[PDB]
Design a protein around this ligand. Structure first.
Ligand SMILES: *C/C=C(C)/C=C/C=C(C)/C=C/C1=C(C)CCCC1(C)C
Length: 247
């Protein structure tokens, strides 16, 4: 529609805000945190373009009587695994462990994708696994990641609790918006439901990303910027104690 595009436009605005908030504050950061910054910027960025394109009407595919958005579902495939990846950076999982969280997000996002691409009502089955699988992911959020992060660093505990709790909550809302919204049985208005959806992606990235800045700001503020080497030739002596007095 013509008024539906407004949604993607709005979401795109929130993305621009985050992108800059993390880009500017990120460049001012020290050496090491850049990983968490570039990552956070990556999600807000990929999303920003997805909203801008969908906002123009491109990527829209027709389906019998309903319309599915490819760039939307695909955007999630690129963002969702990126979010869980962020959580993995905080705690610090293993090589195989990282593959488990990402592989799960792949099959999950794949369930929903084909979910809306159903010619009848088979979607109930696709999402069926999407829900069970979903719980699997949320489990990891409050699973081993708890002991891994709580034992990684002092600041990690703060960023882990705020991010994990916040993310899982709003994320746990997805099963409702997809099932109830148009992608499922369409309870509310196509425009209203979408508003919540875009809001869900916009809240995850920007939401923790904002809290992300505050926390990281305290990490560097506890010592005023990360320490580094200094250039100084021939130090200043003050104590040496002589051993020769009588000879
Ligand atoms: C920035 C965008 C984000 C964080 C998007 C997250 C999306 C999800 C967690 C979507 C989950 C879904 C399921 C668990 C079931 C199948 C349908 C989906 C794709 C709505």
């Amino acid at each position: 529609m013509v008024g539906l595009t407004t949604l993607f436009w709005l979401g795109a605005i929130g993305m621009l805000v985050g992108t800059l908030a993390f880009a500017w504050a990120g460049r001012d950061a020290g050496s090491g945190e850049r990983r968490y910054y570039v990552t956070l910027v990556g999600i807000s960025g990929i999303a920003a373009v997805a909203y801008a394109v969908m906002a123009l009407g491109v990527g829209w595919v027709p389906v019998a009587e309903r319309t599915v958005f490819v760039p939307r579902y695909i955007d999630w495939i690129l963002t969702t695994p990126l979010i869980v990846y962020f959580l993995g950076l905080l705690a610090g999982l293993d090589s195989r462990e990282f593959g488990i969280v990402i592989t799960l997000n792949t099959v999950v996002m794949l369930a929903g994708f084909a979910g809306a691409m159903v010619p009848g009502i088979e979607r109930y089955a696709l999402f069926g696994m999407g829900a069970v699988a979903f719980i699997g992911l949320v489990y990891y959020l409050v699973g081993p990641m708890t002991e891994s992060a709580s034992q990684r660093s002092s600041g990690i505990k703060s960023l882990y609790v705020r991010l994990r709790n916040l993310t899982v909550v709003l994320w746990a809302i997805y099963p409702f918006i997809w099932l109830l919204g148009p992608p499922g049985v369409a309870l509310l208005t196509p425009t209203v439901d979408v508003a919540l959806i875009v809001y869900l992606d916009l809240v995850t990235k920007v939401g923790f990303g904002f809290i992300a800045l505050d926390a990281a700001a305290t990490l560097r503020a506890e010592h005023g910027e990360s320490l580094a080497g200094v250039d100084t030739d021939t130090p200043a002596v003050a104590d040496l104690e002589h051993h020769h007095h009588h000879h």
